[PDB]
Design a protein. Sequence first.
Lengths: 328, 328
Amino acid sequence: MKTIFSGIQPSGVITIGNYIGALRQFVELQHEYNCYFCIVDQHAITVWQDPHELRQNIRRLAALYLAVGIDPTQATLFIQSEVPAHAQAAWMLQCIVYIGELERMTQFKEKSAGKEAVSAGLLTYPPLMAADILLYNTDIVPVGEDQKQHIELTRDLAERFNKRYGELFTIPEARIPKVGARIMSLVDPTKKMSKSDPNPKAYITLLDDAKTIEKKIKSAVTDSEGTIRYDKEAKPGISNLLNIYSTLSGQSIEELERQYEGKGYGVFKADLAQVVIETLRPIQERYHHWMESEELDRVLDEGAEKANRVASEMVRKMEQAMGLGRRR
Amino acid sequence: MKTIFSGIQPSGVITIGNYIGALRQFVELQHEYNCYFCIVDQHAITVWQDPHELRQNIRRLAALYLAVGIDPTQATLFIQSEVPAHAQAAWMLQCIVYIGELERMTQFKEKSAGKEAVSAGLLTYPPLMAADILLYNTDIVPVGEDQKQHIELTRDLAERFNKRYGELFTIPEARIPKVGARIMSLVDPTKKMSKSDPNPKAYITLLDDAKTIEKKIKSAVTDSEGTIRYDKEAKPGISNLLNIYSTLSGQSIEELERQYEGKGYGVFKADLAQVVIETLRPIQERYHHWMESEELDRVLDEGAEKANRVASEMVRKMEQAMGLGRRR
Ligand SMILES: Nc1ncnc2c1ncn2[C@@H]1O[C@H](COP(=O)(O)OP(=O)(O)OP(=O)(O)O)[C@@H](O)[C@H]1O
Ligand SMILES: Nc1ncnc2c1ncn2[C@@H]1O[C@H](COP(=O)(O)OP(=O)(O)OP(=O)(O)O)[C@@H](O)[C@H]1O
Ligand SMILES: NC(=O)[C@@H](N)Cc1c[nH]c2ccccc12
Ligand SMILES: NC(=O)[C@@H](N)Cc1c[nH]c2ccccc12
Ligand SMILES: [Mg+2]
Ligand SMILES: [Mg+2]
Ligand code: NA
Ligand code: NA
């Protein structure tokens, strides 16, 4: 069967945006493909992370992967840094990527937008991501519409290495959901929801309690119209809320528009909070079970062992094509 | 005792400039310090290298290290890529270095001077070099005057990591010879001799045969004065040749100025070629012995084993201070 790879950074607690855009689909995909799902801690430090907070966020992300239903016997779950090959292939790939290609990435221009001094990791993020994917001969990369351009560069890099040194890498293809590929911030409907947004009101984490989910949905930005109808350009806040309600409930935007005829932002909002709470409930319960067992560590040990087996062999192949080291 | 680290890229065959500025001193230093001498193949690919040529240049550099007298029982000789920790600590360090710091490196501005599209590795060279050094708790770094600024940045990075995360790294100090820290190109006395200069006349490799050394010294650029006297500003070509003659023969510039009174660039040049030939003779003989034995591979295996032991433990410490991975 075909291979899948996808990573999420332990730069905070994952949000409903991360769930709807990616994680949710991992759960379905694990049965039809050979999957590698990564906790990308080396990507997380491209910006400051308190060390104690990072260690803790890494463990929570693993518990959340498993809590949503990723079966460790059907997929490989591992931590990026526990597989040295990622850093090794990242260096090889950054020797083939052009500076201009890196400088043109929208994520870089964005995240580096308005900053005086920025880490080089911010700029060199892409080649490490390309390595993450290419090491496993990945066919499909489920994301995450904001990740489209990175995957396009990954394809460019794979082809360049392939034509420069000889066919080695599989050319990966992105898989972006038709719905929910870009959930927006609750506080700024023109920006996507991000787990590292300095304003916690912008996102809902999978670990938010009921009272917190209620407040965040309550203060979500809308408009003075008072009409619950989908209009991304005119009513961006209300359209995003409609989108979340829809993908989480299984109801179409059309159906929700009708159900909410003659209402009523206050009631639409209160209902939505409960829908999100009911969704996270079973996830949170399973999360707590994982956080308190040694089983969590064993799954990660097993996953790194399998990932190291595959990646280190691709690194050997890469070194051989480039002429690094010695004949092995 | 104190620790020493120094690396040379297998981007070509090392030159008399590499020998006079660094390698020669490794031989003396190995008895008074704990030394790690590296074949930096990951630095070499920051620019294009034909894979077959790189594999071969890596083996030749190792044979040359040993041929000049590096004793594998007194020092650790290893290949950079065979120690994954270099790439791992390079990534961690590139997450703490600022882009502006990288853009201001003279080596980068130089090597990227006049190029349309340049690899990111060119720009991110410094953090990998900082990793090479810092992984071993290095006290002294013998180079190589052109490497002073890289070592100053390495100190900046060590301090930053130390104050940001906690004391871990030793602050290294450069050790640059009083004489021969910057041997110049034979063809362009205003530029240093470089093993990758597109013009082979610019440098003399340790593997050049007699006829080749004679030609290169013969066509070395001088001046129309015809006087053999040291004047770096007025007579840059003749001053560089005087410098090479001096460090290789053991005679002072003063002594050579006198010996060559009433001469005679043609004779000064012919004499110099023989002095360089006589110097390389015993080195080349030992080089051939190493190139044809399996002993060369065993020394490198042993060296990587020792280097991996030390480096991987520093990487564990680095990850722990940054919060990467899991408590180990
Ligand atoms: N608002 C969003 N809507 C749908 N998918 C998203 C959204 N934000 C991120 N994703 C997807 O989530 C995955 C993990 O991305 P990532 O770990 O960078 O999350 P993030 O919230 O954007 O974090 P950070 O703010 O630290 O960058 C990727 O597949 C990504 O495209
Ligand atoms: N002209 C020179 N004179 C004295 N030392 C030198 C000279 N060129 C390089 N070195 C020293 O040689 C060592 C190895 O450097 P390196 O491998 O980059 O050599 P290089 O000749 O400059 O190669 P390249 O042209 O590929 O960059 C360092 O210690 C460096 O400072
Ligand atoms: N969302 C992000 O910022 C991605 N860069 C996360 C990521 C890192 N490595 C990956 C490999 C495959 C898919 C996704 C990823
Ligand atoms: N000459 C050069 O271009 C150096 N960057 C070579 C080098 C790579 N790593 C090192 C570590 C210590 C000393 C020197 C080096
Ligand atoms: Mg992101
Ligand atoms: Mg150089
Ligand atoms: Na599977
Ligand atoms: Na020693």
